[PDB]
Amino acid sequence: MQLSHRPAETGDLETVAGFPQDRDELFYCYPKAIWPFSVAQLAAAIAERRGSTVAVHDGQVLGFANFYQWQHGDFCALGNMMVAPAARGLGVARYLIGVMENLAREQYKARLMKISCFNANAAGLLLYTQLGYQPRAIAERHDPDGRRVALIQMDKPLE
Ligand SMILES: CO[C@@]1(NC(=O)CSCC#N)C(=O)N2C(C(=O)O)=C(CSc3nnnn3C)CS[C@@H]21
């Protein structure tokens, strides 16, 4: 996979908003969103957040991420990670995580990245583990059905 990155642009929003395939996938990456996802919801997040970035391969936008918390000299928290359904498990998330780590270090002088992952997303938990993130706490949250879920709060020093 040859991959590149650039800041997200308005022209990318229809594409990226197409990435979540079901209510679960949307909840794992943007729990405040309501199904069905839309460009308006995506743009609302982008406006409130920082560092919205896309990953590109062979002319296709395949991934997106941003920060929902950022604290200069301290840490950032990574969210809205979305990957195109045809490109799952091909290293797009791993690549974007690395890009966002660099951006947190370089731009925000962060010493730490925080990643919070919902308990049902095994693939996320195992990826973040492979990338050196360790679990620190578990917090209660609720899903759209009012069911209790566990948010596993992980972090990694940036160096
Ligand atoms: C403020 O904190 C968040 N919200 C909550 O705790 C509330 S929940 C119940 C509701 N509604 C936030 O906003 N978060 C996000 C996100 O990006 O929207 C995520 C998604 S985490 C994620 N997505 N892709 N990669 N990653 C790491 C994990 S909960 C965390």
Q: How far is the CA of 47 from the centre of ligand 1 (A)?
A: 16
Q: Where are the domains of the chain?
A: 1-159
Q: Nearest Cα to 29, choosing from 94, 83, 82, 92? A: 82
Query: 21 is written with which tokens?
Result: 């395939």
CATH number of 1-159: 3.40.630.30
Q: How many Å lie between the centroid of ligand 1 and the Cα of residue 117?
A: 8
Write down the experimental method used for this entry: X-ray
Question: In units of Å, what resolution does this entry have?
Answer: 1.5
* Strands (E) located in the chain: 4-7, 50-57, 60-71, 75-83, 112-118, 134-142, 148-157
- What are φ and ψ of residue 112, in 5° steps? -150, 145
Residues sharing a CB contact under 8 Å with residue 2, sequence separation 6 or more, in sequence order:
57, 58
- Any binding-site annotation on 81? yes
Asked if 144 contacts 27 with a C-beta cutoff of 8 angstroms, the reply is yes
On whether the CB atoms of residues 69 and 76 are closer than 8 A, the answer is: yes
Which residue shows structure tokens 């949250």? Answer: 141
The answer to whether the CB of 128 falls within 8 A of the CB of 90 is no
